[PDB]
Amino acid sequence: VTDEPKTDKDVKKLGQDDAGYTIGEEFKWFLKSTIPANLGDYEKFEITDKFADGLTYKSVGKIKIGSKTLNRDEHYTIDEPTVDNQNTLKITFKPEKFKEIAELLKGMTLVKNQDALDKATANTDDAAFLEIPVASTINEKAVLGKAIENTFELQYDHTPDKADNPKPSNPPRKPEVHTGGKRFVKKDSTETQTLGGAEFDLLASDGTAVKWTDALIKANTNKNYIAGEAVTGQPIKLKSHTDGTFEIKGLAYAVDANAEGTAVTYKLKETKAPEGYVIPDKEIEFTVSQTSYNTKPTDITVDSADATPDTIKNNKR
Template sequence: MQALAGKSLTITYKATLTNNATPDTAIGNTATLNIGNGTDITSTPANGPKIYTGGAQFVKKDSQSNKTLAGAKFQLVKVDSNGNIVSYATQASDGSYTWNDSATGATTYTSDTNGLVALKGLSYSDKLDSGESYALLEIQAPDGYAKLDSPVKFSITKGSFADSNKITIDNTKEGLLPSTGGKGIYIFLAIGIVIMIVAFGGYKAIKKT
């Protein structure tokens, strides 16, 4: 210790924001150091930069009736500029996240009776790697609805967790739109075949006359 006399001592620490952290609310960044070597010294440095955590809220709805939908299951992912999944999020009980390149162990979020899914404790999007975005990947649609084909991108910014900024995610009932991945394409194919048969029959009748 004598060799360090007169020199600066730098102490670094890592802190994790828990579920108690409110999105978009400034959180004080202070630390207290207690040194005991016969004469106790207590030091509390001046407040450091304020820390913020972000979030977003999503509402799952029927695309036709606007009814909220419960039971939709999602995973939180990061995607690249082409929409390809880069990593999957696993959220611990204290609210912290870890990111992995596999869906194994990824946390599942389910829309509640009001169709709501709320995510908190996320860094703002400008802190992500270049070209990456947050997205919700639907892994199971509500009963009777077609699952979305691709992840839904979103941004985390200051204020994005506010009720006024809720993001609506629509689902279409199976059999209505083939583009959603439902069974509706078979209905359109059947109708097309019937039209072709009728048209061909009409053509033959005209040809005979």
């Protein structure tokens, strides 16, 4: 047993490991490390997080030990993810500052056990650890219904021996996020033909409109499925293509559960019927689940778009 760093990563909030999001919706990952009282001796404390293709890094938030804040460019530096570094974040805690950071720990009770770290739901002076919030979104590269994991590696040098000899610490268990989709086909009442030109407002279960963002637009590039022009801040409106089909990609499901977790209901309000058909007076419910877009997301590295679409029927004038 040592006092050397144990690491863990959470998502959404401290103590949570699984969450579901709509593409473009910003949320926080939490990079977590125990801190030893002899931190002042350390010659390296560098965190590297290679974000999955399907994640877009936004920013690093307020870095905390217990109630105390660490300041950017005073206590640490950031190297942001880019195309050139393969989407990799590096956070370097300044060796010249290790004594000053160690002094901040005075009076604190430090978390020391891996399981205690994993279970931490707060970061306080009486149960303190290093907490790094990282703002992130799920992007268009996600596989719908698939767990998108994250982790990081700490390279730490605990020996004040004037020799560069770091060791790794890694989270034993990885948190994950997921997003989903749905496929549809518009038909007549007896399901004999497909119908183009039906238009639908996309709504949450509570009837509130789902709005476009730049990120959602990037995930739904097939203009055949979009009613009118899609621009950020405006309600999402979808359209059946001339083969009856349309889709929505990147809606949250299993909000507080794993990638196999509970489906979420959304609604379509039909606002335009295909030529010669009537507008219904009831909204259409559908669910987004692990398998509502891809039948086997755990097996694939790109969408297959093979789940059975929901049929939506129209009645003739």
